[PDB]
Amino acid sequence: GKKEESEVLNVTESLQKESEITSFSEEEEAVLYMLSALKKNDLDMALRGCAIDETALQINFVKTAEELPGMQLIDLPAPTSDYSYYFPLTSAEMTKAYIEQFEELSTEIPEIETLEVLEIAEKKEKEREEQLAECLAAQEVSELEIYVKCGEQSYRLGFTAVQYEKNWKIHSLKEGLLYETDIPACVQMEEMREAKKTYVLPNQLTGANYFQAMPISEKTPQRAVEQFIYAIEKGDLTRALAFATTESSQDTSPELLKKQGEYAKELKTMLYGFLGTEDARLYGKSEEQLNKLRGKLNPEYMVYLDLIKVIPIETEENTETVKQYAGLYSYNGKNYLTGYTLCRQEDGWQIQSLSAPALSLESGEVMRLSKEESRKTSEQSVLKA
Structure with missing residues (x-):
C-alpha cells in the first residue's frame, strides 16, 4: 500500500x-x-x-x-x-x-x-x-x-x-x-x-x-494485533510502526523519532525470529556465507505469516489500561508464539511493546512451537502467567 x-x-x-x-x-x-x-x-x-x-x-x-x-x-x-x-x-x-x-x-x-x-x-x-x-x-x-x-x-x-x-x-x-x-x-x-x-x-x-508515523489504533486489543500482522503481510511497515506510536506532536520530535527507531528495531527483531536469523553473527564468515545469510533475510514469505489466535494472558500486572496478549502464528507452516503488551488510548488500543514479561517473552522474542504445542495453545481461551 x-x-x-x-x-x-x-x-x-x-x-x-x-x-x-x-x-x-x-x-x-x-x-x-x-x-x-x-x-x-x-x-x-x-x-x-x-x-x-x-x-x-x-x-x-x-x-x-x-x-x-x-x-x-x-x-x-x-x-x-x-x-x-x-x-x-x-x-x-x-x-x-x-x-x-x-x-x-x-x-x-x-x-x-x-x-x-x-x-x-x-x-x-x-x-x-x-x-x-x-x-x-x-x-x-x-x-x-x-x-x-x-x-x-x-x-x-x-x-x-x-x-x-x-x-x-x-x-x-x-x-x-x-x-x-x-x-x-x-x-x-x-x-x-x-x-x-x-x-x-x-x-x-x-x-x-x-x-514520523502518527498514532493509529483499533477498538479491541486483539484487532490491534491482527491489523499489525496484516500490515506486515502486505509490506505496510510504516502502518505497522504507527500501531505502536503512542504520541503525536505538532513539530518534529527527537524523542518520538528515537522511540520509532527503537520499535522498528523490535519489529525487525521479530521478523528475524521468524526468518531464523535473530541470533546471526557476522564474524568469521566468508563472502559466500554472508551471501547465504543475505538470502535468508528475504521477506517475500511474510505474506504467509498468519496469526492463528491472539490470546489474553492472565497476570497480576494487567491494569484497566495495559494488557498482555500472546500471538500464536503459522509462518509458512511453522508455528510460533510471541508476546504483546497493549495500551488503551482514548480511541482504542495500541501496541506498547512486542514483549510479554508475564510469559518471560522479551521484546521481539519468537518461540518455536511443536504442532502438538501449537494445537494445545490454540485450544486455550486464556494463558495463565
Whole structure:
C-alpha cells in the first residue's frame, strides 16, 4: 500500500517547511550545512543533510559486514538495499542513529551555538576511502577533518561525507561508518588555527528524508494485533510502526523519532525470529556465507505469516489500561508464539511493546512451537502467567 503507508504520516510543522537547496554538489557545502544545523540546534535541518535514503537503498550488505565483524545482525538496520520491503524499518533506525550522533556532538561540544568554522580539511587516506565507498556502494567517500572554535576552545571533528549520483551528503558525523561503536564525537586541539576562508554557514533546508508515523489504533486489543500482522503481510511497515506510536506532536520530535527507531528495531527483531536469523553473527564468515545469510533475510514469505489466535494472558500486572496478549502464528507452516503488551488510548488500543514479561517473552522474542504445542495453545481461551 503506497496509499496505506502515506496516510499514517505525521507531516510535522518542520516537515511542511520548504527546501530551497536542491543538492550539495561539493562535499564542503554538505559539511557546512551540517555544521550550521548543529550551530542552530536544528534537528530537522540536520536530518535532511544526512544520507538516510541513499544509504538505505544502496548500502552493500556483504562489504559492510566485513568492515564490522563484531556487529551482531540485529544491531544493524534492515537490508533495504536488497529487499525494499524493509524500507520503513531501515529509515527509522538510521534516523534514530543520526539523532544520537547529533545529540552526542551537541553535548560533547559546550556552547556549540557559538561555533566558528576555522578549516575543513580532506583527510589523506585513499585506501580507507575506496573501502568505505565500496561498503556504501557510493560514487565517492570523503573523510574530512573539521576544525571549529567555541569561545576560547578549538575542537576537531571527523565527518564521513558520501556522494551518490553527483550529490553529497553526510554519512556520519563521526569518523568511519555510521554503525561503528565507541568513536569520539570530537577532540580538543592544544593549539588554535587561524581560519582559512570565509565559510558560509547556510540556512535553507534541503530535501525532507525522514518520517514520523502518527498514532493509529483499533477498538479491541486483539484487532490491534491482527491489523499489525496484516500490515506486515502486505509490506505496510510504516502502518505497522504507527500501531505502536503512542504520541503525536505538532513539530518534529527527537524523542518520538528515537522511540520509532527503537520499535522498528523490535519489529525487525521479530521478523528475524521468524526468518531464523535473530541470533546471526557476522564474524568469521566468508563472502559466500554472508551471501547465504543475505538470502535468508528475504521477506517475500511474510505474506504467509498468519496469526492463528491472539490470546489474553492472565497476570497480576494487567491494569484497566495495559494488557498482555500472546500471538500464536503459522509462518509458512511453522508455528510460533510471541508476546504483546497493549495500551488503551482514548480511541482504542495500541501496541506498547512486542514483549510479554508475564510469559518471560522479551521484546521481539519468537518461540518455536511443536504442532502438538501449537494445537494445545490454540485450544486455550486464556494463558495463565
